[PDB]
Every structure is written in structure tokens, then in C-alpha cells.
Amino acid sequence: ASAWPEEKNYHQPAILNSSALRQIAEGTSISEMWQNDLQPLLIERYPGSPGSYAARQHIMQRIQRLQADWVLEIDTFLSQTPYGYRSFSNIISTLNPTAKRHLVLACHYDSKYFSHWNNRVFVGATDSAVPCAMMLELARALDKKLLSLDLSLQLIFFDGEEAFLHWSPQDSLYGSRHLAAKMASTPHPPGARGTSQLHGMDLLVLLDLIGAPNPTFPNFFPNSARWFERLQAIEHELHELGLLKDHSLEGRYFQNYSYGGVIQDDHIPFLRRGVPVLHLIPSPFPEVWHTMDDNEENLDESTIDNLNKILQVFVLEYLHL
Numbered sequence: 273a274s275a276w277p278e279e280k281n282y283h284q285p286a287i288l289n290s291s292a293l294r295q296i297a298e299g300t301s302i303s304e305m306w307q308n309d310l311q312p313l314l315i316e317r318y319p320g321s322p323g324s325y326a327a328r329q330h331i332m333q334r335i336q337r338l339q340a341d342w343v344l345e346i347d348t349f350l351s352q353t354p355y356g357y358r359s360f361s362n363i364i365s366t367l368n369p370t371a372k373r374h375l376v377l378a379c380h381y382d383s384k385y386f387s388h389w390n391n392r393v394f395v396g397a398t399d400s401a402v403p404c405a406m407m408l409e410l411a412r413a414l415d416k417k418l419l420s421l422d423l424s425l426q427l428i429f430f431d432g433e434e435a436f437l438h439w440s441p442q443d444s445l446y447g448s449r450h451l452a453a454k455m456a457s458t459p460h461p462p463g464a465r466g467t468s469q470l471h472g473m474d475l476l477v478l479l480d481l482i483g484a485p486n487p488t489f490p491n492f493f494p495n496s497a498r499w500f501e502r503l504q505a506i507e508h509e510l511h512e513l514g515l516l517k518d519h520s521l522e523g524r525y526f527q528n529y530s531y532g533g534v535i536q537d538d539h540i541p542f543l544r545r546g547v548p549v550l551h552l553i554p555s556p557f558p559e560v561w562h563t564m565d566d567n568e569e570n571l572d573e574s575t576i577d578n579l580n581k582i583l584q585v586f587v588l589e590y591l592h593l
């Protein structure tokens with residue numbers, strides 16, 4: 273019985289040197305992401321809504337235009353909700369589908385349902401339109417290097433992360449609770465006797481509530497702590513090389529501190545099934561959290577730009593690209 277599912281415990285990154293770091297920094301464009309990936313997503317897109325459909329089309333389109341051999345799958349399913357049975361659609365973009373191991377980046381693309389209030393519409397800019405755009409920008413910026421790809425990359429855009437009313441065990445995490453169970457009962461790689469797609473998930477990097485100023489991401493899990501340390505190292509070096517904007521070490525994003533409690537999010541269904549998680553959600557949450565003010569106007573551009581650089585370097589180093 274092959275011990276490949278254990279390979280992740282020993283996987284080491286291939287650290288980029290100063291020269292490569294400058295390249296990655298210059299290779300990403302916050303303005304291009306802002307206009308081409310982010311703005312089309314700043315629309316009402318709760319599950320089953322026209323916006324949900326448009327958002328889904330936008331995401332698939334932005335991925336399809338890239339050179340890398342991305343395989344797109346739409347995981348659609350029904351589920352009971354406080355408003356009765358409804359349909360949901362997770363978006364999965366994978367490189368090298370039969371690859372045994374995959375580094376996974378994820379976020380939810382649905383927006384929390386809110387009736388219009390004083391002609392204002394909830395669009396969840398940080399929750400999670402920006403994370404979506406960051407994943408798209410990463411796909412675009414690293415496109416050439418990803419084109420060269422038994423460890424590959426996968427992107428998951430969850431639907432129904434938000435509760436229709438207020439959070440409850442049965443009302444929230446629709447897409448993730450469903451996809452986790454599905455992947456767990458799916459043999460991987462094709463033809464395997466006793467390993468699933470979850471055994472293939474090296475690490476789940478979940479981006480959420482990103483885009484507000486001064487975010488502080490805590491080190492939530494010990495079995496992914498070494499990777500959290502890598503993000504710190506990366507932030508530190510990009511900073512020392514003067515590759516970040518309006519950034520100070522005192523105000524670093526990845527700080528040396530744990531967080532006991534549990535935060536409900538798309539990683540739960542995976543974590544409770546043994547998947548290693550690197551949860552990139554800030555604590556505290558953005559002030560505008562679940563507010564009509566969680567819009568474009570309250571986003572911090574340079575902060576998002578800095579994070580794209582940090583994340584892209586993290587992915588390349590993990591993938592040895």
C-alpha cells in the first residue's frame with residue numbers, strides 16, 4: 273500500500289531568490305485585476321440568483337482564456353434550506369486532474385442574501401469578491417509558469433458559504449459541506465483502491481474576508497503552522513526587498529500568534545475529515561463585515577496588491593515552479 277498520501281507531511285518549498293521575487297512582484301497587476309476580475313464580481317450573487325449565474329460565467333471565462341490546461345467542473349446539487357430545496361453550484365478549476373496531489377486555493381463566490389435596503393445592495397466586496405479576484409489574478413499572473421505542469425494546482429470557488437438567515441449548523445456551508453463529502457467518497461487517483469480525493473489534498477488554503485486595511489491573520493492550526501511560517505518569511509523578504517506598498521513590519525499581516533476558538537467557514541467540512549488547512553481569514557473581521565458598506569469604496573488597494581504578491585510567491589514555492 274503506497275505511502276504517497278504521506279508525502280505532504282515532508283513536502284518542502286523551493287524558495288525563490290531575490291531576483292525571482294522581484295519578477296513575481298512586477299508580474300502581477302492590481303489595476304488589471306481590479307478592472308478585469310474584481311469589478312464584474314461586485315454584484316448581488318446569492319445562490320440561485322441571476323447574479324450567481326453571471327459571476328459563475330465570469331469566473332469560468334477568465335480561467336478559460338488562460339494558456340494553462342485548466343479543467344473546469346461545475347458541481348451542482350440540491351439542498352434543503354430555510355426557504356425549501358434549492359440548487360447550488362461549486363466551481364472547480366484543476367490543473368492535471370489525475371495528479372495524485374494538489375495544492376488547493378479556495379474561497380466562496382456567493383454573496384450573503386439581503387433584501388434591498390434604502391436602494392442599497394449587498395455585494396460583499398471582501399466577502400468574498402476580492403478573494404475570488406485574487407485567485408483569478410494569480411491564475412493570470414502565473415499562467416506561463418503553470419503551463420509547464422505529481423503535485424499540481426486546483427482552485428475551488430464554493431457556492432452557498434453564507435447562511436440564508438443567521439448561521440446555523442444546517443444553514444450555511446452548503447457548497448463546502450457537499451463538496452467535502454463528495455471528494456471524500458471519490459477514489460483518487462482514478463482506479464485507486466483505498467484513497468480519496470481528500471487524501472490528495474496536500475493543503476487547503478482558504479481565503480476569506482480579505483480587502484480591508486490592516487488585516488491580521490492568526491496561525492490557526494498546528495498541522496499547517498510550518499506553512500504559516502512560510503507566509504511570514506515571504507512577507508518579510510518581499511518587504512525587506514522593498515517590494516510591498518505602504519507596508520511595515522510592525523503592521524505585518526501574518527503575526528506570531530495562535531487562536532483557540534473555531535471560526536465557521538468553508539474549511540470546516542474538510543478539516544473535520546483530516547484535511548490540513550491554512551485559513552487566510554483575518555481576526556478581527558473587517559469592520560464592514562456583513563454590512564452594506566462592504567463595498568469597493570472601502571477596499572484597501574495596496575494591501576490587496578501586497579497579498580497577491582505574497583500568495584503568488586507562496587504557490588510557486590510550494591509547486592517548485
Ligand SMILES: [Zn+2]
Nearest residue numbers: 384399434562
Ligand atoms: Zn460573510
